[PDB]
Design a binder for this molecule. Structure first.
Ligand SMILES: Cc1cnc(Nc2cc(N3CCN(C)CC3)cc(S(C)(=O)=O)c2)nc1Nc1cccc(CO)c1
Length: 289
């Protein structure tokens, strides 16, 4: 008789998504994120998932490993991977999108009390990330996903880096696509990323939330009005100059001064003088009481 291999008992990994059942619906945003239906039964009843893939393979693999081990109410859920060298990150899908799409469409529903509750949830997610010794480096309203009218989640970890044990910051090398208008002075000047640098980005995200992500009131729009919109390659040094002078984004319309003061504590020039996420949580909780 012909010799063959004994078949070992097959086990199913719920985090392993087969390419043949992962069916594309549409692009969500750009590296790119797509809405897919994982449909192993082929009858359009499968679960909708968000799929992150490459248009850098090493960076995607590191991102997958970070997200796989993060478990928090305000952090988007990892679901698994789809493997070819190629890899796709599979996450839960949030149909409301980010604060960038949701806030302009739901102003009537989202009052100051709800905005402060979203602010608390962003801080809780960020404080959990910091407790795991990570710096996010991309905290912006476009990366805050809306689970429901009552809950937001940090939804992308593409620039997330680990801070070495007993060290205070991570030094960046690849910075060409940096979101400079959300960056603290130490990031712009020395490419040094502290947990306090994410606190700075939070202050900017809080400004966006309070303006309902209005494009005319965006941090880029406002800073470009303050420094000049036609400076090209000179834009960042003009931005650094402005921040050194003590100039900050103005108080959002209808934002009470006590909320604006918490926001300004995120924007102290020196990282050591900035508020912590825990102190922000306490400040917002005192305003909600
Ligand atoms: C992990 C995840 C789960 N669920 C969603 N949902 C979702 C997202 C969006 N985008 C949010 C970011 N915007 C700049 C572009 C639109 C839109 C919809 S919708 C309203 O069209 O159904 C849904 N997106 C995810 N990630 C994702 C998608 C796109 C871009 C980024 C990076 O900012 C992260």
């Amino acid at each position: 008789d012909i010799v063959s291999e004994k078949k070992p008992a097959t086990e199913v990994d719920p985090t392993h998504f087969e390419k043949r059942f992962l069916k594309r619906i549409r692009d969500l945003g750009e590296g790119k994120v797509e809405l897919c239906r994982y449909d192993p039964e082929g009858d359009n009843t499968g679960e909708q998932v968000a799929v992150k893939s490459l248009k850098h393979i090493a960076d995607l693999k590191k991102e997958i490993e970070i997200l796989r081990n993060l478990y928090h109410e305000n952090i988007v859920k990892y679901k698994g991977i789809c493997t070819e060298n190629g890899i796709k990150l599979i996450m839960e899908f949030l149909p409301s999108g980010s604060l960038k799409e949701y806030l302009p469409k739901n102003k009537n529903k989202i009052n100051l009390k709800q905005q402060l509750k979203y602010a608390v949830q962003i801080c809780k997610g960020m404080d959990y990330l910091g407790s795991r010794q990570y710096v996010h480096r991309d905290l912006a309203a476009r990366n805050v996903l809306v689970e429901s009218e009552h809950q937001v989640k940090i939804g992308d970890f593409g620039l997330t880096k680990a801070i070495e044990t007993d060290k205070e910051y991570y030094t960046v090398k690849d910075d060409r696509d940096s979101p400079v208008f959300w960056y603290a002075p130490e990031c712009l000047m020395q490419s040094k990323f502290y947990i306090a640098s994410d606190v700075w980005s939070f202050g900017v995200t809080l400004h966006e939330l309070l303006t309902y992500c209005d494009s005319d009131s965006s941090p880029m729009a406002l800073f470009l009005k303050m420094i000049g919109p036609t400076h090209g390659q000179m834009t960042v040094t003009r931005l650094v100059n402005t921040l050194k002078e003590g100039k900050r984004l103005p108080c959002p319309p209808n934002c009470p001064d006590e909320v604006y003061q918490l926001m300004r504590k995120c924007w102290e020039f020196q990282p050591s003088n900035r508020t912590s996420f825990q102190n922000l949580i306490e400040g917002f909780e005192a305003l909600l009481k």
